[PDB]
Amino acid sequence: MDKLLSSLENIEVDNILKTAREFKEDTCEEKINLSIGVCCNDDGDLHIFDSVLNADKLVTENYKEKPYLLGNGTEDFSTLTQNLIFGNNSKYIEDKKICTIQCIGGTGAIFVLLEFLKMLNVETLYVTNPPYINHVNMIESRGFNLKYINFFDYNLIDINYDLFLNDLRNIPNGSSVILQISCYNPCSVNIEEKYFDEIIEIVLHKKHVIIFDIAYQGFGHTNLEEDVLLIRKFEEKNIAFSVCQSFSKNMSLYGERAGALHIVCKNQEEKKIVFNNLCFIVRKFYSSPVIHTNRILCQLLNNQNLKLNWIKELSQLSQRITNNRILFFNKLETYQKKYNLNYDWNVYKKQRGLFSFVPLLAKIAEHLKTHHIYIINNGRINVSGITKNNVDYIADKICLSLSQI
Amino acid sequence: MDKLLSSLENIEVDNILKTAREFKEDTCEEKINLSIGVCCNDDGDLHIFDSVLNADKLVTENYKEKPYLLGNGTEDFSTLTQNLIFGNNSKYIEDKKICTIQCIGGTGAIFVLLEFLKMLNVETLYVTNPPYINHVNMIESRGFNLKYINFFDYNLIDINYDLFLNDLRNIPNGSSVILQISCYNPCSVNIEEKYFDEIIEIVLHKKHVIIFDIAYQGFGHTNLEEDVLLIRKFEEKNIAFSVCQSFSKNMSLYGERAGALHIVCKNQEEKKIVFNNLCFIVRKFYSSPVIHTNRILCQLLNNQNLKLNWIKELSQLSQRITNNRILFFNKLETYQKKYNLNYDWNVYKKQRGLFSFVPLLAKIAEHLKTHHIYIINNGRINVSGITKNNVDYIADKICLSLSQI
Numbered sequence A, B: 001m002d003k004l005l006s007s008l009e010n011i012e013v014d015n016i017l018k019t020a021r022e023f024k025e026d027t028c029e030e031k032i033n034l035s036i037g038v039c040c041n042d043d044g045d046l047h048i049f050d051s052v053l054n055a056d057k058l059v060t061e062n063y064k065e066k067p068y069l070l071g072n073g074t075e076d077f078s079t080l081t082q083n084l085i086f087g088n089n090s091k092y093i094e095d096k097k098i099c100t101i102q103c104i105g106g107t108g109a110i111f112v113l114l115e116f117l118k119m120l121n122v123e124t125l126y127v128t129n130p131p132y133i134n135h136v137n138m139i140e141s142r143g144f145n146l147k148y149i150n151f152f153d154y155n156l157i158d159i160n161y162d163l164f165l166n167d168l169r170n171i172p173n174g175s176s177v178i179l180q181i182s183c184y185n186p187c188s189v190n191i192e193e194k195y196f197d198e199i200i201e202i203v204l205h206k207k208h209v210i211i212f213d214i215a216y217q218g219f220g221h222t223n224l225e226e227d228v229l230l231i232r233k234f235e236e237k238n239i240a241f242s243v244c245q246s247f248s249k250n251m252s253l254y255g256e257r258a259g260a261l262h263i264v265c266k267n268q269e270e271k272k273i274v275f276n277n278l279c280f281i282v283r284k285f286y287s288s289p290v291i292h293t294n295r296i297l298c299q300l301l302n303n304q305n306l307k308l309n310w311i312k313e314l315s316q317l318s319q320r321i322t323n324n325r326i327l328f329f330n331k332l333e334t335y336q337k338k339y340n341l342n343y344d345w346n347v348y349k350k351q352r353g354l355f356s357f358v359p360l361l362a363k364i365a366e367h368l369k370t371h372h373i374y375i376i377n378n379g380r381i382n383v384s385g386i387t388k389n390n391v392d393y394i395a396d397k398i399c400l401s402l403s404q405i
């Protein structure tokens, strides 16, 4: 007879779920969904490519057996995939200097890497303020010291590049740091090239260890190689680092949990070791990755007509989004007038990625629910869920709501 | 510049991989594969059903969107699945007393449960001797005390039911115990019904907490509800427990990593809590399960023509295997004569599951490699990989090899 459940309390979850509850917990239709990590279609329902639907078909055509992955990934997976981050061709790729592995989405790659860091002398991790929430949970709940680096400027609404590089300069030495360089979650502010070179110099002097978080290649810009420039610049005049890569939004592969982990190694013989360490680590958890989601990925990425058909719809996507964001603040500059409010909404258009980040709205978050619109506690906003129909209602209620103070 | 890799040593892996290396590391064709966890076809290559190939097709027909699983499983998944272990109908199922969740294979379910046990006052875990290897690794490498209960009798070659229930009687109280009741890995010896009732009585007096490991429903017997009887008996006169369930061999879904976790709860309101705890736990790892492998499973299991077509091929499978095992020792009783050896091979036919377990062979394991046949260090033997062609060569070399002492 299980009694263990006697000491069993219930838990407060992340901001991201108290709200997920709330969206689908009331009677009203015309409910609005602006908190979800997902990207919405024109019809306000989940997105999916055709390239991906075709990769799917392609996969159940070419494959009949379903083997365990030896493996922690394929050979095509680990080359096709790393093309996307390091481009082509690379000093690193064809010299077999990258050890890459298939994980369970970006989350899945982050966590194995953290498990891999406990493996070493890694007591402390730096994260840029404010940080992707789960990073906090994932880091902390395995007893690392979590420290914060200055980043987003809360009053200017841009990165504070002065204080960011400052901390980057007086934080020990060979400190381990997590960077979101593009499509920042939640900030939605990417690092301008103006500053790459200085960083490279700081990172070289301090010999820091960098972990790049790449969840949205192709949302910050029109060209998707742009979004990953710092990495490529880093590679030239070779520095070592790590990459957690998600395709949850890239390929619209949400539930498939498609992700990768890239670790840059000194020689063809360190690659071999780290690999065994990783396989080892993976075996006290789930032993191996999903073969289906491996196949779907190789098929798409490995075929030109699909890669090119996808990249296009992808390029066509970031456009619509950054456009939708422009439109949005323009409706707020307007409705604003009805309530005689005096806010500069122009400063949130600079922003890029799946969201916009309006700290000001943190104040109005629980009042925006009396009307049937849901938004994260901190100001973050799923832009992809604002239809041509939606703008008025939303923008109005934001102002209406704002004026009650 | 990554320096961390300075303290980086390479690791000795489990017996199961030093060998996996070895199988595919030599020039000889007519190499024989008797170590692999997988089940081999007539042609000595990996198995797969037609029901499963059809579920696959079915799935890419009915589904176009790919959402995150809220969720940690579906509603169909958690009812369809638990039918298989608790039968139908159950006192537990329709009274919403089971909390079940979709995991990444059996491994994936074992580990979340262990993470769930650290969550409580669980300092010590009992395992039956000898234990599924990974259990050792998974338990220990998170700082539980691992203790062993008497089980398999090494000289008689059957369970020692006398000493097994003994320990079961003097091991603290509400001790947490892992049981493989059928298709034991490695032993290949299942618990006879003769003894179920006594156990139920012991487990009731000592209030122990049981975790059943079910990786092979349908390999121990002809009827696949048989293999899970103890569980169903346990359910009548309701006791609480847990189930880790893999479909890696059941559905031949190896790389798909299909698995489930069942926890039996006091009321419809403990279910709700444990659920939140589990979601919580899952979120410091991979956040959610694979949607594809969820869909493949529901489709098969939910459609009669496929469930029935699968169960049949399944029932047709355990037959062939236990037959293949009978044949095998009969060739060893024969070739044995050529070398004038005097071993009783009849005692290994009782055995059941994907393997046979012959401790005697542990002695001959590294000599059986000079001939091109591979076998685990402890005696375990993948029976499914012995073709009508193979018997002679294998059985001969075993005897030949045995006689060199």
Ligand SMILES: Cc1ncc(COP(=O)(O)O)c(C=O)c1O
Binding pocket: A037, A104, A105, A106, A107, A108, A132, A180, A185, A213, A214, A215, A246, A247, A248, A249, A257, A258, A259, B287
């Ligand atoms: C910054 C960041 N890192 C990692 C992830 C993890 O993505 P996934 O759900 O595919 O693991 C996300 C969410 O997409 C994210 O926004």
Ligand SMILES: Cc1ncc(COP(=O)(O)O)c(C=O)c1O
Binding pocket: A287, B037, B104, B105, B106, B107, B108, B132, B180, B185, B213, B214, B215, B246, B247, B248, B249, B257, B258, B259
């Ligand atoms: C006893 C036992 N438990 C758990 C597992 C884990 O199976 P999976 O690879 O699907 O996670 C296995 C292997 O099939 C096993 O033999």
